[PDB]
């Protein structure tokens, strides 16, 4: 049964906050990366069935994607900005683990990550 269940995006008993940093993560970081020409393979979980990659989820045990991140930000899933930043980093790292240097998907990930790092550098102070 080739795809795992997707990451959780809803959990009513998990404590949540709305912080100005989490707002920036949705309105600046996510928005910018989402509309990028290279965003599309990252906008939902890797579909190992569709791609015929039966080894994907043998290799990647902590999957993450921007579709998941978008839903987490829109539905106020997080306690802090660092949880969300960790999700972006997991997404990029997984890509580098599974694939090889110079593969198209890696080039795409690198371009998104450069942008991500540019925006995270301007993360607002926690008010």
Q: Does 11 bind ligand BMF (CB under 6 A)?
A: no
Closer to ligand BMF at the Cβ: 11 or 44? 44
Q: Tell me how far apart the alpha carbons of residues 85 and 64 are, in angstroms, rounded to a whole number.
A: 12
Stretch that binds ligand BMF, among 10-18, 22-30, 72-80, 93-101 (CB under 6 A): 93-101
Residue 50 touches ligand BMF, criterion: CB under 6 A: yes
Near ligand BMF by CB under 6 A, which window of 14-22, 27-35, 45-53, 117-125? 45-53
Q: Is the Cβ of residue 22 or residue 70 nearer to ligand BMF in the bound state?
A: 70
Tell me which residue of 6, 7, 11, 5 sits closest to 76, measured CA to CA: 11
């Amino acid at each position: 049964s080739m795809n795992p269940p997707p990451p959780e995006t809803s959990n009513p008993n998990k404590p949540k906050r709305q912080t100005n940093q989490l707002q920036y993560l949705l309105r600046v970081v996510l928005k910018t990366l989402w509309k990028h020409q290279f965003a599309w393979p990252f906008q939902q979980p890797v579909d190992a069935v569709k791609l015929n990659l039966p080894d994907y989820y043998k290799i990647i045990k902590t999957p993450m994607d921007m579709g998941t991140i978008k839903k987490r930000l829109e539905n106020n899933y997080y306690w802090n900005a660092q949880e969300c930043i960790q999700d972006f980093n997991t997404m990029f790292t997984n890509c580098y683990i599974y694939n090889k240097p110079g593969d198209d998907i890696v080039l795409m990930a690198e371009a998104l990550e450069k942008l991500f790092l540019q925006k995270i550098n301007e993360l607002p102070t926690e008010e």
